[PDB]
What we know:
Blueprint (H helix, E strand, L loop, with lengths): L2 E8 L14 H14 L2 E4 L13 E6 L8 E9 L2 E3 L5 E7 L7 E8 L1
Parallel strand pairs: 4-7
Antiparallel strand pairs: 1-7, 2-6, 3-4, 3-6, 4-5
Amino acid sequence: KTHVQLSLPVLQVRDVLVRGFGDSVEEVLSEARQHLKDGTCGLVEVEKGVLPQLEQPYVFIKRSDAAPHGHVMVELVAELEGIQYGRSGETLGVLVPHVGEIPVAYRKVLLRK
Length: 113
């Protein structure tokens, strides 16, 4: 399927134990996609102070349309040293590995895969 419905646990940045997916733009997009598939991906909502507490390269989910069955359609965009790889809409948050942290909410998305 070209899109998959996921509900992503929303984590507070200071709870996150593994603060990024890897060391290159290609690796973090790859690992993010794998973790999304395996159900082991969390979401940190971006506010002042958040991104410097996380590890670059970042993986964002961004809105890719103006929303079926309650799920916002999203796509991945990576960022490294101020340059983004991918082009999309508003940021919904930054993805991180989930290794059992307790979420504050869940965010329903329709992921372009």
